[PDB]
Structure 1
Amino acid sequence: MIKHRPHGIEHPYAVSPDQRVPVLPLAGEPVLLGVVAPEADRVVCEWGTLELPLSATSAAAADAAALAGGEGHLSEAQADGAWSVQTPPLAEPVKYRFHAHRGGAAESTEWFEVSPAVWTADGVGEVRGGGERVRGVEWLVSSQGVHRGRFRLQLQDGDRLVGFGERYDALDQRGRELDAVVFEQYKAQGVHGRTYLPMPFAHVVGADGNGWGFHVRTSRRTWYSSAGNELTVEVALGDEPVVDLAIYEGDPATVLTGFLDEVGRAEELPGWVFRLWASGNEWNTQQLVTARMDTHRDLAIPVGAVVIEAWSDEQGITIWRDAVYAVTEDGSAHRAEDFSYRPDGAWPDPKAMIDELHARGIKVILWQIPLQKTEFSTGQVAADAAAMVRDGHAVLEADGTAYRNRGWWFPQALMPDLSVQRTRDWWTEKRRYLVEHFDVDGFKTAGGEHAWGHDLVYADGRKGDEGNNLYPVHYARAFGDLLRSAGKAPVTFSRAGFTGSQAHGIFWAGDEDSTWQAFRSSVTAGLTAASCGIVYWGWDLAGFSGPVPDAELYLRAAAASAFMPIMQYHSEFNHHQLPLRDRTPWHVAETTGDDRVVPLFRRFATLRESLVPYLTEQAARTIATDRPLMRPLFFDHENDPEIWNHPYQYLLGDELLINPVLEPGATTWTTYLPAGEWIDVWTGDRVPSGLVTRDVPLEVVPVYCRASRWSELQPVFS
């Protein structure tokens, strides 16, 4: 047997051994041809009129690590039935196929074709809307059609580029190469410069004149680079060679208003989301969740929400673990009364647990994935999978078969097609009893990045090249709507999204190690996301992955996060080994032996509770004025050049300036205070504008209040 798939697995940053590299060669480029034929003595390619012998070797891989989820998931530095050959350069369309044989038994692949492409300024295609800001329009064309547009936006000296969704490497992207595509990068997002939540939108800000911004209106992939005075924008295309480009003019907030008016905006969430969120993945039973929350109560560390990740049967992920019930063969949803819960099960009485948590004022959030596992051939999970295919609730391959997940996380799983209302209904209907009976307050909607390939088909008419980036938006929206339909606020908690995600729930920065570098990246992620209109945002403070963080990093992160839109701690699945990897304050104290951790965390959490009315009012202003909640200084201060030397500072709402302590061992910290009158919130003293240095013991993160509103904020800090 011999396999060749010209596009391959379509990992957006990687190639697979069965494919053509590159998929679309420029004219003059050679192409590398991979093929997988596990048992073959010899493999040849019939390439045009030539015959090209294949060596046994693969492309390549550092890409196989990538296909396994990247370095965070896999090493195994090394350790495949793969063959490859490099062709002559491509001067024209070539038809090719492959011939292989094992010891005198031969096979032939189907014919394939590849047409070389060239960049040209000549064409019927147009870039609409950029006015005189756009120069150098070119199109990437082949005998097949127009594949991509490209053009340049004029920049002025002093201009910064801030935007592009949620970014972990830098606030200002000028001088860098980046793209916008939804991808799950497992940790080290800043290092790779990738993101779960890209947007083809940015602020152009800081030149003497008034600033502006742009939105490429596409859900297809886009690429960006800036050198000298130009920003280069490359746009993947569908059948129509048109790029529609929106330009917004004004101060940064007004620029944002134009964008959000077009693509959507946050609505006001209940004030309780501003309290502390407690989480960890290994709280997998009723006993564990109640024990952890009891410890919160007993240590007097206030918590407003608890996330339960492994709550479920781990199959369909819509039923409590150990619940007993009659499987519905037709794949229909269950009523609450379908279920009974055994005394010895993982969750003997989940309603009583939730009622008690509610009585203490703690909200409850359940984990979700937009995936139906196929690895089980029996039970409810299998009945629902069959129902998805039968009734058309599954995202489809070009050939009409159901898409099977190509990623490393739950491979082969189906994706519910959330692009249309009927399937959004069907999928969330299975979760309805959780909200209506069990009174669950939210969903942590994890994942959403799983759709790979350009020719996938969605029921809304879109193909995968357009629709795959949109999928996480549909995903958050679906569960938001479930909550609304039960009369509850649309609180979804999501890592992934795209243009339009602004209007659905809450977002967290995703998976990271516990390191100062990850801490710094996360701040940048919140700042850039806010610049694009993502209002309720948080991260896993001091990281959820690997060994428990040291006291210093933990407390630095906790202090800063108390000043961020969403304060949450979290911990990754450890295989239930001992010792625990919990990120709870008391387990961190236990692990480090540091007796400052619990009392100082308590103070931060206690101050946090006092900040809820302020955060609530500021959130409402953010939603009304589009001036961000976690606010880079260029929004109010844009003509001040000095602000760009302190990219990790921000305004929390109008009145408070925050300066996270981002390095280990720091006994002092310097803050740049822009034009205005300031007050150190810890001493209540007046402070002048400009650079200000103060001591930073662990109980302090630098915070300053506008003098005129300090009367309102003073009780919070007393």
Structure 2
Amino acid sequence: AVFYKEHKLRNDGLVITTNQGNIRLQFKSEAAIEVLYRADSKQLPSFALAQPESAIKAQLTETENHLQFSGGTLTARIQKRPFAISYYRDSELLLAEESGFQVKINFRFYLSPGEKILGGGQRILGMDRRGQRFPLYNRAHYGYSDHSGQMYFGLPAIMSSKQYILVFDNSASGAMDIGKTESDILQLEAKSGRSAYILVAGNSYPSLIENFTQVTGRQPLPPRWALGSFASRFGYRSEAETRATVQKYKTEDFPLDTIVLDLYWFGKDIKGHMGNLDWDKENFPTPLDMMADFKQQGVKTVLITEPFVLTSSKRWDDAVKAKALAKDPQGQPKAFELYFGNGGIIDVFSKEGSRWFSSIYKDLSKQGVAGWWGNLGEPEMHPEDTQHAIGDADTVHNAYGHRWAEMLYQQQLDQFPELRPFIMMRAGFVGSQRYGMIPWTGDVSRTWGGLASQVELALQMSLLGFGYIHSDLGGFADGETLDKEMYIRWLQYGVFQPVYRPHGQDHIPSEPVFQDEETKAILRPLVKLRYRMLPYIYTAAYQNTLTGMPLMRPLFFSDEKNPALIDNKTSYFWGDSLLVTPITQAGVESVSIPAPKGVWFDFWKDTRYQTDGAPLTLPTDLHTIPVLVKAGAFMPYVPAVSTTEDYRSDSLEIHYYADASVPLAQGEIFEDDGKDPNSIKRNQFDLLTLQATHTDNQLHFQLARTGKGYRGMPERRATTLVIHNASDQYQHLDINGKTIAIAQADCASTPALACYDQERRQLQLVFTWGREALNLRLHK
């Protein structure tokens, strides 16, 4: 039994007193509120909030039975007796406390009937997690396939079909019960830690996500090279093997930006060496030369590191001496028995641990390392009596990887202010995207079921802040022989998901260059396609930095008033314009694609489909997976290069999918130097915009460029615009007032400036796109 006693306004926050204690309500923006219970007491600080100190001016009003605390769009309605807070956007009820806060830490809320709930981070349970209960304790799930209640990267957060996100801003071992035990109750629980939640509201899913990343953090633009081709396995055993792999990409004509070194870079065995954090010189004898030789070919080197220092490692005595390891209650370094052997964990929450670990990353980065892979950050083993500077293991567990990322990000920015950090990690917390975290879905089995789960995992993580969530392409764990069809399908899917990193245990090759002739003939043009599409992908990345819009978007974005689409995990959007349906079983001869109402083109064949609502059935083939292009799309391409270090946009090729059903369309292409972390902040970019206006007798394109440019930006780009489904009735083209005849023959066979191909229904315009505005008008 709880009731309101009294309140006050202090530094813009509402502090309420009940019979049980203080409750602090601070608006972190007009659409987001932090509710801290036990506000009087000492607690762990917020991990989820980018600006935990902020509180914007809100309006407070009082009635007999209630208080009302409001920002722009979000309102807290505080019932006094009994005490219960509920939340409104306009006058629409978003979420209501049932018992609310109790004692262990426990929050209880009502779920509305029919409300669907996404959330929890990585689980394989279905997109709507209502009816499920699961722990909040990051933990490995080696060899998962088609089911998991608990894996590497949980998030104490949910997204509802009422268009709110609720964050449990707590780092401890806990649980979430989403109307499982009691059908109308959402229950959040933890053994300890901060007793706070954060509610964020939005008018649409895009703007919900914008509001969420506003308060939790925006991912800084990764380096363009993160969108390229990675060579990775577990693991290259030597410098010779690593050089041979870079050579294999060159001799097989596959693009390659980055080679990834797993744990053999620091010792010859899986066990016994972890914590060395230095080169195994028997097997990597000249590593500075190795890395420099790779940079000459435009190839970056990424190294694996882990949180654990073994007692057999060369750095045990030094870490103990520096007080860098987590301790037992007696105050000594805690040691425990990992797979790898007996060892400790670096205390990233301490000053000494942070300085010690940072110094090692600084040293190796000085040697030539371009980026970093932090594995086992759950932490994979984390005994409960381990003591970190700010709490015990069970209290801090779900924030360890988050602080690891923060530490490393700040260190990389301090060492290289002019470069974008690359940080790939397996486990984090809400807001870890602000430290550049690029997560992957862990040790997936080499099975169709492991592939079939990747879209679900990717969308769940994308929706709550993680644009660059990806998988070990081709699968990671076990297998005795390559499943060639599954491998091909996983790497085709790869092209249309955030990071192109095939990776597997090295008894079966993960890299496409080591595959048979048929597999390489299929995949080589697709990996080249990934490079030709960099302007599309990099522009979606730019949008993710600006607004949190994920790269992969769920089918349900296409119709916000049809909540049944929330269940789909088999088709998704890659950027604005491509509806992708990965093939996730062997021998599938056709697929039924639940395309939204409108006009759609076969990405591979140019075929036009119109649909009222009924799904489209497309046949399948082994060389592609089904991709449809939305009418009104602008798809930008550049020529394929071997490495993004060679990237040029001097030549553009843009494909516009015309249909009279889309009278107005827009596209953009974001160009910058691909490496400067301050490019967007300082407007050191070239933002190309394109607008189409499509009426009965004309098709008009308006082209423009903004921003201050960047060093090496071409002043003039040779541009080929290919208009698919173009009317055969266009008589002439006006370019900036200058009339040009449209040729009706020999388009492919003459240096034609405007040419209509009657057999393909494609009108091709070739022109120079300079810094001034350009208008292209086609008239019947």
CA contact (8 A) 1:284 1:311 kept: yes
1:512 is the counterpart of 2:449: no
Q: Are 1:213 and 1:248, in contact at CA under 8 Å, matched by a contact in 2?
A: yes
User: Equivalences for 1:166-181 in 2 at 5 Å?
Assistant: 166-181=122-137
AA of the residue aligned to 2:458: G
Q: Distance in 1 between matches of 2:193 and 2:569?
A: 41
Output the amino acid matched with 1:402. Answer: P
1:152 CA displacement: 2.8
Q: Classify 1:521/1:466 alpha carbon distance in 2 versus 1 (closer, same or farther; 3 Å).
A: same
- The AA in structure 2 aligned to 1:640 is N
1:136 and 2:70 correspond = no
Corresponding residue for residue 151 of structure 1: 108
Q: Which amino acid aligns with 2:330?
A: D
- 2:265 aligned counterpart, secondary structure: coil
Pair 1:401 & 2:340 matched: no
Residue 319 of structure 1: aligned partner: 278
8 A contact 1:280–1:572 mirrored in 2: yes
Mapped partners of 2:127, 2:239: distance in 1: 42
Q: Deviations over 1:146-184 (max 9, x none)?
A: 323141332232x32112222333222122222322112
Q: CA deviation at 1:258?
A: 3.0
Deviation at 1:411, TM superposition (A): 4.7
**Cα RMSD after superposing both structures:** 2.7
Partner of 1:553: 486
Deviation of 1:127 after TM superposition, in Å, equals 7.3
Contact 2:555–2:568 under 8 Å retained in 1: no
- In terms of fraction of residues, the more strand-rich structure is 2
The amino acid across from 2:483 in the alignment is D
Conserved? CA contact 1:129–1:246, under 8 Å: no
Instruction: Give the aligned partner of residue 670 of structure 1.
Output: 592
1:189 touches 1:195 (CA, 8 Å); kept in 2? no
Give the distance between the partners of 2:401 and 2:544, measured in 1 at CA.
24
Residue pairs, 1:575-594, within 5 angstroms: 580-589=507-516
For 1:359, the aligned partner's letter is Q
* 1:355 corresponds to: 292
> C-alpha displacement at 1:699, in angstroms?
0.9
How do 1:2-13 and structure 2 match up within 5 A? none
Q: 2:628 aligns with which of 691, 699, 704?
A: 704
Identify the residue that residue 394 of structure 2 maps to in structure 1: 465
CA distance in 2, matches of 1:711, 1:383: 56
**TM-score under structure 2 length normalisation:** 0.65
Hey, what's the Cα distance between the residues in 2 that align with 1:243 and 1:602? Answer: 50
After superposition, residues 568-717 of structure 1 pair within 5 angstroms as: 568-572=501-505, 580-589=507-516, 595-641=517-563, 643-644=565-566, 646-689=568-611, 690=613, 691-710=615-634, 712=636, 715=653
Matched, 1:566 2:499: yes
SS in 2 for 1:688: strand
2:575 is aligned with what amino acid? G
For the structure 1 residues 559 and 125, does the alpha-carbon distance in structure 2 shift closer, same or farther, using more than 3 Å as the test? Answer: farther
Letter matched to residue 494 of structure 2: S
Kept in 2: contact 1:548–1:583 (CA 8 A): no
CA distance 1:548–1:358, change in 2 (3 Å): farther
Distance 1:382 1:150, change over 3 A: closer
| Pair 1:429 & 2:359 matched | yes
Counterpart of 1:495 in structure 2 is: 426
Q: Structure 2 counterpart of 1:271, which letter?
A: R
Instruction: Find the aligned partners of 1:452 and 1:190 in 2 and give their Cα distance.
Output: 26
Match of 1:17 in 2: none
Taking the TM superposition and a 5 Å limit, the aligned residue runs for 1:130-529 are 133-137=95-99, 146-157=103-114, 159-188=115-144, 190-205=146-161, 211-220=163-172, 221-227=174-180, 230-238=184-192, 242-309=195-262, 310-313=264-267, 314-322=273-281, 345-376=282-313, 380-387=314-321, 391-405=322-336, 408-436=338-366, 438-450=367-379, 452-454=382-384, 456-459=386-389, 461-487=390-416, 488-503=419-434, 504-529=436-461
Structure 1, unpaired ranges of 5+ = 1-123, 141-145, 323-344, 574-579, 590-594
In 2 relative to 1, CA 512–200 (structure 1 residues): closer, same or farther, beyond 3 Å?
same
Letter in 2 for 1:549: L
Shift of 1:676: 3.7
Paired position in structure 2 for 1:53? none
Question: Which residue identity lines up with residue 147 of structure 1 in the other structure?
Answer: K
What is the letter of the counterpart of residue 447 of structure 2?
Answer: T
Do 2:145 and 2:447's aligned partners in 1 also have CA atoms closer than 8 Å? no
Q: CA deviation at 1:647?
A: 1.8
Q: Secondary structure at the match of 1:470?
A: helix
User: Counterparts in 2 of 1:16-31, with a 5 A limit?
Assistant: none
Q: Per the alignment, do residues 260 and 190 of structure 1 end up closer, same or farther by CA in structure 2, a change over 3 Å counting?
A: farther
> 1:137 touches 1:149 (CA, 8 Å); kept in 2?
no
Given that residues 165 and 498 in structure 1 are in contact (C-alpha distance below 8 angstroms), is that contact kept between their aligned partners in structure 2? no
- In 2, distance between residues paired with 1:369 and 1:126? 46
Q: CA deviation at 1:542?
A: 2.1
Q: Distance in 2 between matches of 1:264 and 1:222?
A: 24
The one-character-per-residue Cα deviations of 1:659-703 (angstroms, maximum 9, x if unpaired) are 101111112122111144322111122222341122211111111
Q: Deviations over 1:71-114 (max 9, x none)?
A: xxxxxxxxxxxxxxxxxxxxxxxxxxxxxxxxxxxxxxxxxxxx
Q: CA deviation at 1:201?
A: 1.0
Contact kept? 1:127, 1:245, Cα under 8 Å: no
CA contact (8 A) 1:129 1:244 kept: no
Q: CA deviation at 1:652?
A: 1.1
After TM superposition, give the deviation of residue 187 of structure 1 in Å: 2.2
The farther-off stretch of 181-190 and 346-355 is: 181-190
Q: How far apart are the structure 1 equivalents of 2:329 and 2:120? A: 30
AA matched with 1:650:
Y
Distance in 2, Cα, partners of 1:166 & 1:469: 13
- 8 Å Cα contact 1:271/1:613 also seen in 2: no
Give the 3 Å change call, closer, same or farther, for CA 263–381 of structure 1 in structure 2.
same
Structure 1 residue 618, shift from structure 2 partner: 0.6
Shift of 1:307: 0.3
Q: CA deviation at 1:279?
A: 0.5
Separation of aligned partners in 2, 1:199 and 1:172: 15
Structure 2 CA distance for aligned equivalents of residues 447 and 610 of structure 1 = 34
Q: For 1:565-622, what per-residue CA distance to the aligned partner results, in whole angstroms no more than 9, with x for missing partners?
A: 011111225xxxxxx4222224442xxxxx4201111111111111112111111112
TM-score (norm 1): 0.71
Measure how far apart 1:138 and its partner are.
6.9
SS of the counterpart of 1:539? coil
- Structure showing the higher helix proportion among its residues: 1
Amino acid at match of 1:155: S
Instruction: Give the Å deviation of 1:255.
Output: 2.2
Q: Report the residue type matching 1:565 in the other structure.
A: P
Aligned amino acid, residue 567 of structure 1: Y
Sort the Cα spacing of 1:130 and 1:233 in 2 relative to 1 into closer, same or farther, 3 A.
farther
Amino acid at match of 1:709: A
Gap change, CA 1:273 and 1:211, over 3 Å in 2: same
Contact 1:511 1:544 in 2 (8 A): yes
Cα distance in 1, alignment partners of residues 459 and 410 from structure 2 = 27
Q: Write the deviation string for residues 321-378 of structure 1: whole angstroms up to 9, x where unpaired.
A: 02xxxxxxxxxxxxxxxxxxxxxx31222122212211222111001101111135xx
When residues 435 and 243 of structure 1 are mapped into structure 2, their CA distance, relative to the original with a 3 A threshold, is closer
Aligned to 1:531: 463
Distance in 1, matches of 2:83 and 2:294, equals 58
